[PDB]
Design a protein around this ligand. Structure first.
Ligand SMILES: Cc1ccc(C(=O)Nc2cccc(C(F)(F)F)c2)cc1Nc1nc(N2CCNCC2)nc(-n2ccnc2)n1
Length: 267
């Protein structure tokens, strides 16, 4: 990681909360807009270990679809993690505010980017545990980048049941993200309670197809939701399939049947 001097950082707006400090939007000089997570006076030993350990892991990552670390302030207080700023913000909110505005190819391109970032993380032996559209950031080129903190509806059964978090439970979450993207940010399982979601999944029910969804994309998300973890595709399989669908875009024209809930009779 690069050490940044505090005189190069201006905090402007609070945009979130950290584990022991705030997250700001600001500017970095060397101006470029940045996001800034602070660790404030009184933090514990464990919090400092986790904060600097987070900075270190982010510093190791170098991938188009992973949020970029600009640097760290560790020699002065408050300590800070400084990342690039993504002006379109979080993917879940972004899609909900732009309902129906994108082509199928654009949406699938988003998913290919997320999958490539996740393939990289899994290969680097990083298990995310919290993959969801709320943790994806979108830039002004529509590039999606994975982010993380320092979620029953998104979590694979074995991770809920016995705390087995692996890249294969991240694949389950990726399937949910696919459904979030294709529905423009609909809440998975709608108003079902957490217990009702787990009961439905255990009974074998799965989320139905989104409207206007390519058959190939629904098939892929369904295979991410296999109960047996070993049967789920790996991220390499997901990236390969999405890349081939994008490169032969007529493949996306065949749509899965949408189960209408409302039927209107007109002559
Ligand atoms: C300052 C900051 C510090 C750390 C991280 C971060 O990602 N650490 C991380 C740790 C482990 C693994 C991964 C890995 F995923 F990469 F693997 C990533 C992101 C940001 N910066 C930042 N964080 C968020 N969020 C919101 C959603 N929840 C996550 C944090 N949003 C924005 N942001 C919003 C608009 N423009 C920018 N910036």
């Amino acid at each position: 990681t690069t050490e940044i001097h505090p005189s190069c950082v201006t905090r402007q707006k609070v945009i979130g909360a950290g584990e022991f400090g705030e997250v700001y939007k600001g500017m970095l000089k060397t101006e470029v807009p940045v996001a800034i997570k602070t660790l404030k006076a009184g933090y514990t030993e464990k919090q400092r270990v986790d904060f600097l350990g987070e900075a270190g892991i982010m510093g190791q990552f170098s991938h188009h679809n992973i949020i970029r670390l600009e640097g760290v302030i560790s020699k002065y207080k408050p300590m800070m993690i400084i990342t690039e700023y993504m002006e379109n913000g979080a993917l879940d909110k972004f899609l909900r505010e732009k309902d129906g505005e994108f082509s199928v190819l654009q949406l699938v391109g988003m998913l290919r980017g997320i999958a490539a970032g996740m393939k990289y993380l899994a290969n680097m032996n990083y298990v995310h545990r919290d993959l969801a559209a709320r943790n994806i950031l979108v830039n002004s080129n529509l590039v999606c980048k994975v982010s993380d903190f320092g979620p029953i509806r998104w979590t694979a059964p074995e991770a809920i049941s016995y705390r087995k978090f692996t890249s294969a439970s991240d694949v389950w979450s990726f399937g949910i993200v696919m459904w979030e993207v294709m529905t423009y940010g609909e809440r998975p399982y709608w108003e079902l309670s957490n217990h009702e979601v787990m009961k439905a999944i255990n009974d074998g029910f799965r989320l139905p197809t989104p409207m206007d969804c390519p058959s190939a994309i629904y098939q892929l998300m369904m295979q991410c939701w296999q109960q047996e973890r070993a049967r789920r595709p790996k991220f390499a399989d997901i990236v390969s399939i999405l890349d081939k669908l994008i490169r032969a875009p007529d493949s996306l024209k065949t749509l899965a049947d949408f189960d209408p809930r409302v039927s209107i009779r007109l002559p």
